[PDB]
From a paper:
We report two cocrystal structures of a mutant Ralstonia solanacearum lectin (RSL) in complex with the recently described sulfated terphen ­arene (STP3). Ralstonia solanacearum lectin (RSL) is a case in point with four polymorphs identified to date. ,, RSL is a neutral trimer with a toroidal, β-propeller fold. Sulfated terphen­ ­arene (STP3) is a large, rigid, triangular macrocycle comprising terphenyl sides, methylene vertices, and 12 sulfate substituents. , Owing to the sulfates, STP3 has high water solubility and a low propensity to self-associate (as evidenced by 1H NMR in D2O). We then turned to the mutant MK-RSL, which contains a Met-Lys motif at the N-terminus of RSL.
The MK-RSL–STP3 cocrystals grown in sodium citrate at pH 4 diffracted to 1.7 Å and the structure was solved in space group P63 with one protein chain. The ∼2 kDa and highly anionic macrocycle bridges two protein molecules by a combination of binding modes. One protein chain interacts with the macrocycle via N-terminal methionine encapsulation. The thioether side chain sits in the macrocycle cavity, forming CH−π interactions with three phenyl rings, reminiscent of methionine–aromatic interactions in protein tertiary structures. The other protein bound to STP3 interacts in an altogether different way. Here, two loops of the β-propeller fold engulf one side of STP3. Circa 470 Å2 of the macrocycle is buried in the interface, and all four sulfates on this side of STP3 form noncovalent bonds with the protein. The carboxylate of Asp32, previously identified as a pH trigger in calixarene-binding, is within polar bond distance of two sulfates. The crystal packing in space group P63 involves honeycomb layers of MK-RSL interspersed with discrete layers of macrocycle. The interlayer crystal packing is mediated exclusively by the macrocycle, which apparently functions as both a molecular glue and a spacer.
Numbering used by the authors:
A (entry chain A), B (entry chain A), C (entry chain A): 0 to 90
Amino acid sequence: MKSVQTAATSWGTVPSIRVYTANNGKITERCWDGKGWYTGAFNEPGDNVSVTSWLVGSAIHIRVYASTGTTTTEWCWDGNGWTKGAYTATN
Amino acid sequence: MKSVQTAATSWGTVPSIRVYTANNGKITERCWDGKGWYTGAFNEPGDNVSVTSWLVGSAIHIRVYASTGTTTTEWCWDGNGWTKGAYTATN
Amino acid sequence: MKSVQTAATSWGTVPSIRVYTANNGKITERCWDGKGWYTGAFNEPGDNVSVTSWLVGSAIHIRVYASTGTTTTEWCWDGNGWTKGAYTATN
Ligand SMILES: OC[C@@]1(O)OC[C@@H](O)[C@@H](O)[C@@H]1O
Ligand SMILES: OC[C@@]1(O)OC[C@@H](O)[C@@H](O)[C@@H]1O
Ligand SMILES: OC[C@@]1(O)OC[C@@H](O)[C@@H](O)[C@@H]1O
Ligand SMILES: OC[C@@]1(O)OC[C@@H](O)[C@@H](O)[C@@H]1O
Ligand SMILES: OC[C@@]1(O)OC[C@@H](O)[C@@H](O)[C@@H]1O
Ligand SMILES: OC[C@@]1(O)OC[C@@H](O)[C@@H](O)[C@@H]1O
């Protein structure tokens, strides 16, 4: 057994918070935006996770780097669902 | 034996930096703000750590997600000491 | 065998993205800035990695915290190559 691994990001004034947790090979997402926490749409395989986000005006963009073994898959939020990104690692 | 795990955040112009380190089940905090590094008030159990921070005007708010096993505790800095937050994980 | 560990940061409008990956004791860096991913100059030992970045005007500053065992080395980007920073951990 082992500890889960998390990554977090935030934006805005309230603020909006996203916390990604890698738990036994699966990454899920929890969301805060002023009231209580709730579960987000992100759900992808991964043993390790990192995240970064940026704003274009008021629109949030999120990149989640999910790693299983030596394979890191980037997942992209740009307002309309999660999609796989072009990220590949060195060599 | 194993490697420590860290998380970092920063704000401002100098800037101010916070680095959280999980070392053998305990998370401590180091701080930079223009001169040298010094130890911060955050000290809580955890094998894994992540962090995010945001500003309201000039006031910094920090959220540290500390995980021991499958249990993740959120710790909140809002100007006046660290307090436990409402975060819980999916299901 | 084990999974790689990553950290990510971003800045700007395009945006610019940096992803650091600790893979079998070595951390390398991948970069995005509007077209495709390419390999960055950062290459240092480490089993765990975290990152934070900030802007001074339009100039990016990056701090990468590389941990091997209980030893965490800070690496600094301030526009002109990576250099070791003053970071040390508690006690
Ligand atoms: O409001 C929740 C949500 O839509 O915010 C953007 C992303 O975090 C999504 O995965 C998530 O479902
Ligand atoms: O819109 C998707 C995308 O282009 O966004 C910027 C980078 O995250 C890329 O890897 C990714 O494919
Ligand atoms: O100046 C250090 C400090 O007060 O900054 C806010 C938090 O990082 C605290 O834990 C820490 O003691
Ligand atoms: O002020 C504390 C709090 O409400 O801040 C926003 C979120 O981090 C919540 O989980 C947390 O309880
Ligand atoms: O454009 C790539 C680059 O110069 O950007 C700043 C740092 O990420 C460097 O390691 C990297 O080579
Ligand atoms: O310019 C280097 C430096 O002073 O930048 C701020 C902190 O990251 C310090 O540890 C580091 O030595």
